[PDB]
Swiss-Prot record:
It comes from Bos taurus (Bovine). GO terms for cellular component: extracellular space; serine protease inhibitor complex. Ca(2+) binds at E52, N54, V57, E62. Keywords: Calcium, Digestion, Disulfide bond, Hydrolase, Metal-binding, Protease, Secreted, Serine protease, Signal, Zymogen. This is Serine protease 1.
Length: 223
């Protein structure tokens, strides 16, 4: 996250880190047994790490749980990043507590101008490389679909939305992929792609979760 702030430990309790020997993607806990992330985060041998703040220090509220099953969206297209969403099932149920909490699926889509919370452990500089070890947070609004389509002609689908600031300076970035975008207490977005980070007239692009709730609910009940 570029231009954000330190969230505070476990102030974002649905936040997970996907770990394959190292942190490589964010994710969101949606119930005690299931995590949602980005399809581009797909890999084998994933361990899900819950209750994290500093991802390099064991602080006492962590739960480390291997994934039993991963399900990439059936229509995920790696070239265009359409349908950039995946479900991960935990080998054993997480223990929910103040520090580890699930986030609610939306009942409707969010409107442009709605304020959202984006979080993650990704790079914090737009120019350089600097990875934080504590969770960073950014408040950002959903942009109008026409600002979004203007920035990225021919690349935005109905399953994507843009959020951030056209002036640049504040954005998600490398290492934040798969993480949550929470607006009005509901998961509305997944960190998906962008061009650079925090560059002018290049806002972040997010998977539009409100389009997938039926698929999510049907898939978790069948697996
Ligand atoms: N907001 C953003 N500015 C933003 C930039 C980049 C990404 C993602 C995605 C991305 O832009 N590419 C291509 C891919 C994927 C890659 C994975 C980690 C970082 N990249 C995500 C967000
Ligand atoms: Ca830790």
């Amino acid at each position: 996250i570029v231009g954000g702030y330190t969230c505070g430990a476990n102030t974002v309790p649905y936040q997970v880190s996907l770990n394959s020997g190292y942190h490589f993607c964010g994710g969101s806990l949606i119930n005690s047994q299931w995590v949602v992330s980005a399809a581009h985060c797909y890999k084998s041998g994933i361990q899900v790490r819950l209750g994290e703040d500093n991802i390099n220090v064991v602080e006492g509220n962590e739960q480390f749980i291997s994934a039993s099953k991963s399900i990439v969206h059936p229509s995920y297209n790696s070239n265009t990043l359409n349908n950039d969403i995946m479900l991960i099932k935990l080998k054993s149920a997480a223990s929910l507590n103040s520090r580890v909490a699930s986030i609610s699926l939306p009942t409707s889509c969010a409107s442009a101008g709605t304020q959202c919370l984006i979080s993650g452990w990704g790079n914090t500089k737009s120019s350089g490389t600097s990875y934080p070890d504590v969770l960073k947070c950014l408040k950002a609004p959903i942009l109008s679909d026409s600002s979004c389509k203007s920035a990225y002609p021919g690349q935005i689908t109905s399953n994507m939305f843009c959020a951030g600031y056209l002036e640049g300076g504040k954005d998600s970035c490398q290492g934040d992929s798969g993480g949550p975008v929470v607006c009005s207490g509901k998961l509305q977005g997944i960190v998906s792609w962008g061009s650079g980070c925090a560059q002018k007239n290049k806002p972040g692009v997010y998977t539009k979760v409100c389009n997938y709730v039926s698929w999510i609910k049907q898939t978790i009940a069948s697996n």
